[PDB]
Amino acid sequence: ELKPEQVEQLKLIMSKRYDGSQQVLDLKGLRSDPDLVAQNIDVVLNRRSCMAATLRIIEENIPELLSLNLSNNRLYRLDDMSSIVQKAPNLKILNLSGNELKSERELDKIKGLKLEELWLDGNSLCDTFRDQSTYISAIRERFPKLLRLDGHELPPPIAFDVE
Amino acid sequence: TIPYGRKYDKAWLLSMIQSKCFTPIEFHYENTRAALKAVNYKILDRENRRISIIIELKPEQVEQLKLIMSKRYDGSQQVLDLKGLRSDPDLVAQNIDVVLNRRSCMAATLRIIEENIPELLSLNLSNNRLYRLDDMSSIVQKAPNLKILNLSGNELKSERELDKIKGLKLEELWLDGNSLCDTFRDQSTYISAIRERFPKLLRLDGHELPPPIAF
* CATH code assigned at B21: 3.30.70.330
Assess whether B109 and B146 both reside in one domain: yes
Number of domains in chain B: 2
CB-CB neighbors (< 8 A) of A109 in chain B: 141
Experimental method: X-ray
- Domain boundary residue, one of B36, B55, B74: B55
Q: CA-CA distance, A90 to A99, in Å (whole number)?
A: 23
Q: CA-CA distance, A70 to A27, in Å (whole number)?
A: 5
Q: What is the DSSP string of chain B?
A: --TT-TTS-HHHHHHHHHHH----SS---BTTB---GGGTTTEE-TTS-EEP------HHHHHHHHHHHHHTEETTTTEEE-TTGGG-HHHHHTT----TTSHHHHHHHHHHHHHH-TT--EEE--SS----GGGGTTHHHH-TT--EEE--SS----GGGGGGGTTS--SEEE-TTSGGGGG-SSHHHHHHHHHHH-TT--EETTEE-PPP---
Assess whether B27 and B90 both reside in one domain: no
* CATH number of the domain bearing residue A68: 3.80.10.10
- Domain boundary residue, one of B12, B37, B55: B55
Assess whether B95 and B30 both reside in one domain: no
Interface test with A, best of B111, B141, B142 (most A CBs within 10 A): B141
A87–B contact, CB cutoff 8 A: yes
Cβ atoms of B69 and B105 within 8 Å: the answer is no
For residue A43, give the H/E element and its range: none
Assess whether B34 and B60 both reside in one domain: no
Question: Resolution of this PDB entry, in A?
Answer: 2.9
Assess whether B123 and B140 both reside in one domain: yes
Residue B208 distance to chain A (closest CA, Å): 27
β-strand partners of B73: B80
Q: Which residues form the domain of B7? A: 1-55
Assess whether B46 and B71 both reside in one domain: no
Assess whether B141 and B190 both reside in one domain: yes
The rounded radius of gyration (Å) of the Cα atoms in chain A is 16
Assess whether B65 and B152 both reside in one domain: yes
Assess whether B22 and B94 both reside in one domain: no
- Domain boundary residue, one of B38, B55, B72: B55
Collapsed DSSP state (helix, strand, coil) of residue A37: helix
Assess whether B151 and B184 both reside in one domain: yes
Assess whether B119 and B209 both reside in one domain: yes
Assess whether B21 and B125 both reside in one domain: no
